[model samples]
Target: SHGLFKKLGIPGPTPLPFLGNILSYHKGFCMFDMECHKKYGKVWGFYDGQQPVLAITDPDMIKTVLVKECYSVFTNRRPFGPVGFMKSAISIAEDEEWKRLRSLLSPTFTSGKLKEMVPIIAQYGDVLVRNLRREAETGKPVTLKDVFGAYSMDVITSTSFGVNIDSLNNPQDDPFFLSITVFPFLIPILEVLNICVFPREVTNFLRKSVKDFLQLMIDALSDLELVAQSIIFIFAGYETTSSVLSFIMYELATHPDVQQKLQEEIDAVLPNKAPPTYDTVLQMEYLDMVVNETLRLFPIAMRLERVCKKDVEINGMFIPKGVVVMIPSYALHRDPKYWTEPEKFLPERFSKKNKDNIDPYIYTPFGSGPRNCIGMRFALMNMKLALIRVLQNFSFKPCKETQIPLKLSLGGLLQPEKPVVLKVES
Candidate 1:
């Protein structure tokens, strides 16, 4: 009878008549939450223009929500109102549908499947480095995000959608690329509106818009592009992870010691200038940590959230069905409780010995549970492989423009605010 909100001890931002914090908190989503944490410790609530949104920044509380008391408290992730195709995708699928789709696609992303594609993955990383070196030859500062964006697009094309879109070489300014540009700017507003008003409409529009053109490429594989999986990978590969890498290289430019450590690990693991096979990627433990650390600091996923499927208890708080609960992975990665010096970028935190010290839920760069990022293994491998190829070929140095850390991108879900610039010399 007391209700879930009462059990959680959660408080929120003040809600005004009709508007809520819509106008004030609307512009930047995650930054708004960061501001809330700074102003109010651990827990607070706000009206996202009339929707009662409660934010919890406590690591333990988030753990309980994600791991200790998962079922009754959360459903599939909360941002289910994307496009119809992605809405139906396992990332947002709930209950039986979630189980079914995830089961169907699970084998596709296995270590073995990813292993078979390593040669292609390495090839894309090679193309990126070659392209950067070529750009370096021109004496023009390269937009690292553009390079990384093409790199991720190549990977995603080969893997997910199963087509070859060589945006990396041609740098084709096509509608596909344009669509990738449009979504980030659009999704947040649509997402906020979906939460505050018509959640169903978001999925409706999304499904209508997201045609499986990539999937179709799998059926019509006539060329090397087909071998690259260009169709499937285009959108998935292009944006978020690319942005993360762009930001990461930006950090590496400024933090040369960290970069050197990462390169040393890559060199140690793959002596004699070996290509990063899946097995070799496993051996690149320290490089893996570097990528994990980058995810910790500049996680593109931002938050892992779930809606209450039924009544649930987490962190000693009761949550009713349909309530949206969040494990702000971004916030948790920086929380003082689970991590020592959480703000610092330390790759060793993910080392075998220290990783055991972490609660599985506490450090989720790729997420966990039934709906974790399906392409996580491939994504991580590509990131490491890309870094290996790039660092092997070019020295990244910090420029005056690289001084400021990147701001989060307002446009898409996984993006940075500012373009991070670095000096690439071969």
Candidate 2:
């Protein structure tokens, strides 16, 4: 009758045998975790069907587990399975293999390596601008999801694979019509409801395209590893950047004052309607703040988790071997203890003059330590370039169709509960 939280003298809501504290997560895990943070203080325990997951929302322990002890006791993520070929991807690779793949792929995102890709990414933004400007004249509200999704996809493909196809140019075109754990006892029922995030048909088609990308884009990395890496670049890069762009636009539209401020920054940085070069884009402080604050609010990866490589106890916090140690970043970002007015839309929290006061672990939209996102620079470049180009010629306004307060749901990435429709002005 030993309980995970009970034996350890940790504080959390009691749980039953099979479902644990997870039944509260039916609508979303982010909100559930948020509630748990307030109720149980910084550290809590829950079960994925008695799997005994520990949630840590404290910043000091966050640094220790995700950074200091990362290589030793928390080197890997919990194995999310039937994981398939993604297992070969760097984001999913484990142990020695993870180290090897990370070293091989890390250089691709260096500022020097990424500077050359800006021109390529900017033209796609230009393509989106011209096409969307015509839609603006129609005076109809457009869903930012479709608008930015196409733009993000085109950019990722052209830059990552050297293949140029525009879903923006042809709205009718289809590309990839694209996690975890469990209550192992309940997953079968969930999959039966068509809730399995990756079914065979979809995975096989992805596996098929990974092979096709091999034929086209795989001269260097070679074989399944390259294929897996391509999937990470093409697929992960595509969806995440797109959703964040959508969220950013939603925030900008609703907060017109913020939008005006950002536009002023864009104008000052790139006068005469030129595209953003790497140097100029990085120089725009307001642009960076807007993007950072947006990520702080809606970090696509809502939580970062690491599995204990062995028994880990730090400063009286005990985690057993095989326990999944989770850092609910969304909760931490909004905690009143760390952020002033945690629910407000203020980009200045990340501004240069003010940001040094914030703890790094309290604001990890891209994760931390060695296993952090390898493509962050590339992703940020795509988002900033798209914003620079679009805002130069157009502005976003909350239309009749726009959702004033976004209702979000969590999948692998956090997403808006509905399509956000906003008008674009030329």
Candidate 3:
């Protein structure tokens, strides 16, 4: 796995025999990969423990891997199998099984279905604003990440399962909220243990423990597939949307001019302070721009990964079967060639004129291709409703507890390193 590149003419940093380039992934995963892209050219080889990986950031290469190649051929993601019901999720399922799962679940998040869920999302958005209003009243610094996580969790639980769980009001009381934490901390630990320490016995024991924990709920529901879908829905919908909302608020806190502009837009749409309707949310041009720009800067999944099912050649590069291809979205989104002022928070970058000029493959926040996120419409709708209702009543301002230049978490989901405390003005 470590010695194939020289004969194939591919180049990369020299791997350390058995450890390969595993130690090179220090601190932030996305940041580390971006550093590698700069040090080595576009197409380069790396190793994940012993398995050889080809890391690609070039737009054409990304397009070929994510889009041009048929999904069936390059279907499976890198195996980071979580224990319990999570293993059954379409998020990690492979081949025809993935296709079957995708087909079964596609209709639930269709455009029509999402619009139908608007009233449900609006109700939770109301709860979110009321919760923040209380904090505003006391002038208390609030963690927006926790606040938004509760809000999104409530929305997902209600719309997906028809169960109303207000994590905002009763955070500790909800079993669903508490259970979701298993993956956040566990995922990173599993990666390190598997890669560096080779602690198989401990990892296997922990995996079984988690499965046992999930088995109780699965038996209670009496339907393993239904329960599995619910788990994936809650896991996928909760932190991803919550993280995006927090980052959007963080940007708003720092950029008052953009906030005021967005407020004016919101005020025009809901002049009488009426609840944001499906049509109303869709009509806000600037809201869409802000959401798009935020996603561009801080996408949920750091990398788009796919394993080769068979030998393939692209741009004269031969990729043997089973080689993992990594497309780093964080690095690609900030590449200066594709973006002007790549590091700046310019919502206008997504304005029609500018957005039209961008290549679709380069700015994928929800990812691209056939296996792209099926919940894209649901996520966007949930986000717009929450943002509109919150912005209409309150403004987010950085507080003493807030970190000015936000420090990112090392691994797992990219989130603010600390609680994103902010002042709420109602």
Candidate 4:
């Protein structure tokens, strides 16, 4: 069995025919890839339907491939047919197109650009808190996690689409939520097929079966893709950031000490005044630690992918061009070698005295290198603003419904299997 797996250069459970070890990834493995990480150590291989894939967690090797040795061994991103509608955006573009687009759009996400949007984010934070207060008045058990989710969705919609989705006002109405649920059910199957056959014709044949509206939205977004400025600003910008806000609230609800520390920092930095600004949000060191800690534990996008551009050696293992190599951010973030007490929520790991102990790659929830997340600064500003505003008025505590030791949502994010409930009270 070891010989078979070794020859295939794949890890995880044994593969057989069409299933290709798919069942194994679900054998109580986390949405965060924790099970694979536990079984394989730093480097493991897997077959996504006879296609050789590797999951890498070595910090030094990761840096080498993603940065220094990038040209020889990496493309901008691995192909994902289901999300291919987003291919026009910078995340998937490669070669000169990637460099040109990256250059053209780089300034928009700069500290200066994100700084300009800070006030807008702070304003939303204030509104969210008032809305929550109103909800609490009704005795309906308003949840901080749910409230923050709405807060995040609203902010992301505004920034990304330049459309006010009013998710804060009408949380359940946004089409984005619909996409998360419906698309996940449709696309993952298509993705597995795309990987197995690599048939552009067949993939296109199946795509015709998806919703016209969904396809239209993607096509419309692609038209804006070439604009080279704020292309994915609204789409990816808010989604990941909003998800982060929800998870942070979840963690804080569970870790009382960290929550108190972050709340104190928020008060000191923003002082119960108008919503916190970008500069103010940045000022709270403890808040940064809190956010980092949460991201380390509950990374929504647990896997990072890059296509090999040329043959190269990864920690002495040879990999060929055009193959997909993945960095399991979840594995790296929680690996015991890099993080002491990896499972526990300790924001102090990011505190001043101990931050230097972290390997830069080990903590990359937003990812790193040239093809890293473009909306990172914007996302951070919004996350901080949203959390600070919520913290200013209410203390969040885990309720009976909160999923302790959170479970992953199958085939979606590494999120709580059920919505983590937190009682929000003034």
Candidate 5:
């Protein structure tokens, strides 16, 4: 009974040999983690095979791990990378390499840089609405994910790769190894040689963008690094943003009152119903609140990982070397302690008068500290623009197929188990 998980002194479900507790994941990562948190409290341990993983949600201890001792003892996501591509990317690069690459690439996602991207994103917003307008009048259930997924692909491909893919119509003939998006962390090493679906496209895009833009540090970094970074950007931006769009649409469909308030807020901010620019998107109060509440409920990064770099002590807990610490973000966002009536969709919790009272670490929609989501501002801007564009012309309602309560699939993202089918109206 005390075997495998004995070192951590944390309580979790019984492990079956090398299989660990992976069998319990059928309920989805967030739900299973929520169950574990309910049964075992904040700090607990489970296993990925024989390797023990510590699932910690205690606010104070999380602060210590993610912030205070972050660089010193808990820098890397895991002890090993998925494969060569992962190891080369900034996300998995070790210590000094990670720090250097992070600093070098950080400026690209800055306010000025993102300001340059607004026009490009707004153009896509127009395209999204144009494409959806046809389906709206049909009175059929529109697959929200397909349409938004294309929109997501179009924006990232254009912004990052400098490739203007008519993704909504043509739907991504571009070869970005999208398999990495769904199963980002757990990609098997064998998949690398099979065919890097997006690798060469990224390289070609890099060559074109480098020749055209002349701003990115393409020459400073190697070709492989450039390709890897580009692919990661497209993948991360595409999957998370698209998933959020789908979830937000579903929420609006189910919650008619919330949807009405959001639409009213959008109308108030932009009276002419123009395609939302970055600054305009920022101005809408209820839109921001709805986005925050949606992200809180359906975070893409279900669990944030940090490998124990050395035998380290955080707060009072002594964590040994080589242990993997998982900060279960999905469970924490819905926790009853920090959030009242945690299951309900209440955007007012993030209202102008109440937002500041909550802790940043608790409502970690984009994560916290240095290693958080770099494209957060851009992602929010992208989401809001699309939302305004769609909500301006069309309203969503629950169709026969729309999954109420959203039964999610267990993966890196909190994806709906089936296609998010919703009724669209003009």
Candidate 6:
């Protein structure tokens, strides 16, 4: 098993029998992949237990898996240790089930539906600003990550379940927030240990337990099963969006020039008279650039993983079925060959003059091809609305607690190692 990558001619870190490369990534996934790319060109291999995982950063090869060979070879995302109700989500579904779920959920994120959700997001966005402004008045150090987490949770709850929960005002009201937050970290750990964290039957039992204990309305038993869909949306929307918002705000706090430019764009587009609308927010070119640049720097979902459904050959290398193909999105987004001054935060790189030079596949924050993030439009709209609202009310400034060169959290998602604290000025 250790020599499998060598036999296949792929370059990567050595795997220790049963442990595989788990210890290698114990520090952090982003930097580990960065080191791998520096040492082993574009395509590399490692293992999760006995599972053969290929980490590919080449743009064309990424295209092959995501687009060109989508259905024929690599259609399913890498399976996780049973996450109970989450397994039923479109994110983890496979074959015809994945297709069916995606089709059912696609309409929820369409332009029309997302546009309708804008006002709902704005309602929470306003609440965020109001609460943060109060924090600003207190003149005490505040971690923006917590604030943003609550804000995003509020937005998601309202839209996803038609349940208006103000976690920002009353964080204690909702018990579900705790479950959603812990689920992301639990996934990788359970998968590594080869344990199914939560079985569906167990989840169904828990759901029934809650129903019985709380005396909630259950029109049908099928409706309880479908609660898994809502759980998926809540989990997806909660962490990723909050992480991005925190990073964006952290950048804004640190880079005054970029923040000023973004504020100016927001002001120019929306003006003082009218609130930010979906149509107007999307029209702001600089806002788009700022968001794109931030995503390039800190993609919340650092990598995309797909499992090969069948044996396939691409660009001279043969990949057998059951192999997990991982795309190093963080590495590709920062590669100097594609991006000019890769370390710098230059929003102009995404401007019309410079964007044409970029390969579409090289910078994928929301991923690409058939099974990319279903909530892409919803996320962008949500983030844009929040940014527009927040920047309009107050400006972010680095406080004493702010981490200048932020460290990545040691886990699957790209999150700040410490709480992102910032000073707010109106």
Shift in Å, residue 424, candidate 5: 1.1
TM values, all candidates:
0.78, 0.91, 0.87, 0.81, 0.89, 0.88
lDDT of each: 0.63, 0.78, 0.76, 0.65, 0.77, 0.77
lDDT of 1 by residue, 271-358 (tens): 7777777777777777777777888887777777766667665566565565566666666677776788876778888888788887
Model 3 agreement with the true structure over 79-189: per-residue lDDT tens digits? 663344445667877887787777767777766777778877878887788778878899689888777888888887777666676684574212222222233334555
* lDDT measured at residue 255 in model 1 versus the true structure, 0 to 100: 77
Residue-level lDDT of model 6, residues 43-68, one tens digit each, is 88988767688998767888998999
Model 4 TM: 0.81
Predicted candidate 5 versus true structure: per-residue lDDT over 257-370, tens digit per residue:
988888888888788886666688778888888999998888888778888878877878888877788888888888888899988988888998999878877778777767
Candidate 4 error regions (>4 Å): 1-13, 28-32, 82-86, 144-146, 160-162, 168-231, 272-274
Clashes of 1: 32
- Go through the candidates in order and give the clash count of each: 32, 0, 0, 4, 2, 0
- Return whichever of 1 and 5 wins on lDDT: 5
Candidate 1: misplaced stretches above 4 Å?
1-9, 23-27, 38-40, 57-64, 67-73, 79-87, 168-234, 338-341, 410-414
Cα lDDT, model 1, residue 228 = 22
Question: Could you tell me which residue pairs clash in candidate 5?
Answer: 175-198, 177-198
Q: Where in model 3 is the C-alpha error above 4 Å?
A: 82-85, 168-222
By summed lDDT, the worst window of 10 consecutive residues in model 4 runs over 209-218
- The total of clashing pairs for model 4 equals 4
Candidates, ranked, TM-score = 2, 5, 6, 3, 4, 1
Give one digit per residue, the lDDT tens place, for model 4 in 1-426.
Answer: 223447646556556664455445543234436677778676777655445467787788788767776655685675544644445557767777677667766656666657666766666777687878887665455554556666676776555444555564564322132233223345567655534222465434434422111222443133435432333454465556656777887788788887887777777766645566666667788888888888888876677877777777777877766566888887778788778888898988988999988888877888788777776777777777777777878887777677787776665456566766667778
Off by over 4 Å in 6: 169-225
> Considering every candidate listed, which one attains the maximal TM-score?
2
Q: Candidate 2, TM-score vs. the true structure?
A: 0.91
